[PDB]
Design a protein that fits this description.
Blueprint lengths: L4 E7 L1 H4 L19 E8 L24 H7 L11 H10 L8 H15 L1 H6 L6 E7 H12 L4 E6 L5 E11 L5 E2 L13 E4 L3
Antiparallel strand pairs: 1-2, 1-5, 3-7, 4-5, 5-6
The protein binds adenosine monophosphate (AMP) (2 copies).
Protein name: RNase NGR3
GO molecular function: hydrolase activity; nucleotide binding; ribonuclease T2 activity; RNA binding
Family: Belongs to the RNase T2 family.
Length: 203
């Protein structure tokens, strides 16, 4: 009951699909070449977080019916076998959404709204940071470009492609507990930060 803030986590689809993991496009076809939503996670300032707050509250698709087509494109599941994303959304809703104090519809609308508000791809483009092979960009340039359009610093999570290149994988931004506005992150994710120069791979 109650938490401190939300980590709003977006992902670069291309970086989930160029590793040794299996990646399958959603039953709706190849996803947009844009940052997608991974999740909206309630969190505590002490680094821990609540999860699975209502193991009885299953995902009611009727509450987000008119949002399904948008989510298939902005919150796709890239896991295999190819799915419609419902399993992925049900998982995020049960594990994290039930702990957000938000109704199911508000929770998913919130995620969609912040993905749009943060407008990562465009902000990067405005700084001449566009997808291409190889570790062509400085982490600093990427962080500031995002800071410019959001007004808050993001945390960048990097992984590695089959080539061994370090690439931008996920972008963390913090949202206030009422899911109204972006805020400065009280704390940043555990895992190791990125290298000084990283790859922003295309599909
Ligand atoms: N609120 C959180 N803050 C930091 N890491 C998290 C949080 N919730 C989940 N994780 C980790 O990040 C990944 C997100 O997975 P999931 O909870 O399935 O969306 C898992 O590998 C978790 O260990
Ligand atoms: N875009 C995605 N579609 C479906 N599952 C995902 C996606 N991104 C992450 N996952 C899975 O959720 C978990 C999150 O861990 P991580 O790979 O560290 O982000 C892993 O078991 C991933 O396979």
């Amino acid at each position: 009951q109650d938490f401190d803030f939300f980590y709003f986590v977006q992902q670069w689809p291309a970086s989930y699909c160029d590793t040794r993991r299996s990646c399958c496009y959603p039953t709706t076809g190849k996803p947009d070449e844009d940052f997608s939503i991974h999740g909206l996670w309630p969190n505590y300032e002490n680094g821990k977080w609540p999860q699975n707050c209502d193991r009885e509250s299953s995902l009611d698709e009727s509450e987000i019916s008119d949002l399904i087509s948008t989510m298939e494109k902005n919150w796709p599941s890239l896991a295999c076998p190819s799915s419609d994303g419902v399993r992925f959304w049900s998982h995020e809703w049960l594990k994290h959404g039930t702990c957000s104090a938000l109704g199911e519809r508000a929770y998913f609308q919130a995620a969609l709204d912040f993905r749009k508000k943060s407008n990562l791809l465009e902000n990067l483009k405005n700084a001449e940071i566009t997808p291409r092979n190889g570790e062509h960009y400085t982490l600093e340039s990427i962080k500031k470009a995002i800071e410019e359009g959001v007004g808050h610093s993001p945390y960048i999570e990097c992984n590695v492609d089959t080539q061994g290149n370090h690439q931008i994988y996920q972008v963390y931004l913090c949202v206030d507990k009422t899911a109204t506005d972006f805020i400065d992150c009280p704390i940043f994710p555990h895992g190791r930060g990125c290298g000084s120069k990283i790859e922003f791979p295309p599909f």
